[PDB]
Amino acid sequence: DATRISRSDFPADFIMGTGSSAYQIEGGARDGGRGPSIWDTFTHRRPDMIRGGTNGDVAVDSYHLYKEDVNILKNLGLDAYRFSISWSRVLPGGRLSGGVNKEGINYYNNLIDGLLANGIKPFVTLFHWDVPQALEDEYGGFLSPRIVDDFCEYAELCFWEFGDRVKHWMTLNQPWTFSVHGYATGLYAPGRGRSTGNPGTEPYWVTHHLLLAHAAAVELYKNKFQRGQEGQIGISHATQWMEPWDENSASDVEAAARALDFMLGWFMEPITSGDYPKSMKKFVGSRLPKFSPEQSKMLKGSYDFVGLNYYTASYVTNASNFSYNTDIHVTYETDRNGVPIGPQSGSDWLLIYPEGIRKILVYTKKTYNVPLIYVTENGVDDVKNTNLTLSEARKDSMRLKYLQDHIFNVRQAMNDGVNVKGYFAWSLLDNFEWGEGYGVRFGIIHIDYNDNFARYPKDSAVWLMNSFHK
């Protein structure tokens, strides 16, 4: 049973942790010499696109309050903390000739030594959507294949400055979301595809360039750093469990496999076999870029581990100019007869379905044969409500149950044979939630926006410490 799950149900080397990303927590957007990212410009030029018209200029101020975040982490007692570096903080002009920012480097070094002083292992992500405005403006950012070399320079700086203490790297986090909402729906930065954007072509190019940036950085680590620093490198993917609306309709079963193909296979097959998935070549056809054979050779097996981010699940059925959305030829169902696949969380797109994580995990292992997996993101948001006082606000039973059920399911997946090495809840703190602004709370630590972002643990944090301390 789930409510009894605890650290002793897992192997000794298993790792528990929490996470954040730079733009959602740091603030200090124009402090310590940081240059602007595309999220800075998007939130400031297109405030109508953000709930409340807000931005992450200050966010929850971890730039200044990191000593406090570290204390929280020490009190929480878990093994590891996942965070990302802001590219334009260390390189404000995105490329080397734009200047190297010592002060931004000093910030991450302080954060990292702080965590190590306290027995907390840092897991570091190079990239979480925050493309330096300078590169976006000079050559369209990830639209251009120039992005691959600049990203490499960026990565080499990080390995050089931090790699003596950081032993666990990830190139990208959730590239799917960046591609799709950046270039297909236009809801996220840079906000294209609603020249001006083409949901039919751009997403495929962006993704193509993401994968090459990732493979080049991995080759760079492996050939120039791994032997001296002895770390490991990988990548983190968005996933959603895709379930056949009708378990009988072989048509529905294939729609579900195709949906997986277009979300996770899009990224996973290239680093497994060096190529896009069959179904995408078929349905996308000539709008889908091709890898030179030496590229395929670089991509193939370009990782030491893979992380999966899981939130929700869905029923899939077949569908009946172009765009990524329509190329998939599926339709999404939440109800199987006015019977929802699971209950709503605070967000109407997030339906709670614990077994989804067990299935995605088993599927990933079987389909792609990954030797080593971490769950790098998993969590839920509180029902919105500005009426509660802190004693009420902090009682987050839904999240508490959500975490138990999902962690229990991760344990199942390991019995099923999947080599899962760790699990990170998302997120540490309530923070900036992109298009949703500050209205949506994902943190195990509450934040009081009315009082300098005072931090206070929620019952889930207390529970994680008690059940998983070490």
Ligand X SMILES: C=C[C@H]1[C@H](O[C@@H]2O[C@H](CO)[C@@H](O)[C@H](O)[C@H]2O)OC=C(C(=O)OC)[C@H]1CC=O
Question: Interface with Cl ion by CB under 5 A: which residues?
Answer: 95-97, 389, 391
113's contact among Cl ion, ligand X, its own copies, none, with CB below 5 to 8 A by partner kind, is: none
Which of 10, 19, 21, 22 binds ligand X (CB under 6 A)? It is 21
- To its own copies, the closest distance from the beta carbon of 411 in angstroms equals 18
127 binds ligand X (CB under 6 A): no
Distance CA 305, CA 365 (A): 12
Q: List contacts with its own copies (CB under 8 A).
A: 6, 29-31, 33, 35-36, 41, 44-45, 47-48, 52-55, 57-58, 74-75, 77, 92-93, 95-102, 133-134, 137-138, 149, 153, 156, 160-161, 164, 224-229, 386-391, 450-452, 454, 456-457, 462-463, 465-469
Q: How far is C-alpha 462 from the chain's CA centre?
A: 24
Span from 107-115, 194-202, 304-312, 321-329 in contact with ligand X (CB under 6 A): 304-312
Residues with Cβ within 8 Å of residue 117, at least 6 apart in sequence:
none
Residue closer to ligand X, measured from CB, 247 or 348? 348
Span from 137-145, 316-324, 351-359, 426-434 in contact with ligand X (CB under 6 A): 426-434
- To its own copies, the closest distance from the beta carbon of 421 in angstroms equals 22
- To its own copies, the closest distance from the beta carbon of 59 in angstroms equals 9
Residue closer to its own copies, measured from CB, 251 or 452? 452
Q: Which of residues 235-294 bind ligand X (CB under 6 A)?
A: 238, 240
Distance CA 180, CA 100 (A): 31
- To ligand X, the closest distance from the beta carbon of 326 in angstroms equals 17
108's contact among its own copies, ligand X, Cl ion, none, with CB below 5 to 8 A by partner kind, is: none
Which of 324, 434, 438, 463 binds ligand X (CB under 6 A)? It is 434
Distance CA 112, CA 104 (A): 13
- To its own copies, the closest distance from the beta carbon of 386 in angstroms equals 3
Using alpha carbons, select from 23, 22, 19 the residue that is nearest to residue 437.
23
- To ligand X, the closest distance from the beta carbon of 106 in angstroms equals 26
77's contact among Cl ion, ligand X, its own copies, none, with CB below 5 to 8 A by partner kind, is: its own copies
Residue closer to Cl ion, measured from CB, 187 or 393? 393
Residue closer to ligand X, measured from CB, 198 or 427? 427
- In contact, 457 and 68? CB cutoff 8 Å: no
Residue closer to ligand X, measured from CB, 116 or 383? 383
- To its own copies, the closest distance from the beta carbon of 154 in angstroms equals 11
- To Cl ion, the closest distance from the beta carbon of 339 in angstroms equals 38
- In contact, 25 and 89? CB cutoff 8 Å: no
- To its own copies, the closest distance from the beta carbon of 298 in angstroms equals 19
Span from 152-160, 309-317, 367-375, 404-412 in contact with ligand X (CB under 6 A): 309-317
Distances (CA, A) of 66 to 25, 173, 300: 10, 22, 38
- To its own copies, the closest distance from the beta carbon of 15 in angstroms equals 17
Residue closer to its own copies, measured from CB, 17 or 93? 93
Using CB under 6 A as the criterion, which residues of the chain lie in contact with ligand X when the complex forms? 21, 174, 177, 238, 240, 309, 311-312, 349, 377, 427, 433-434, 442
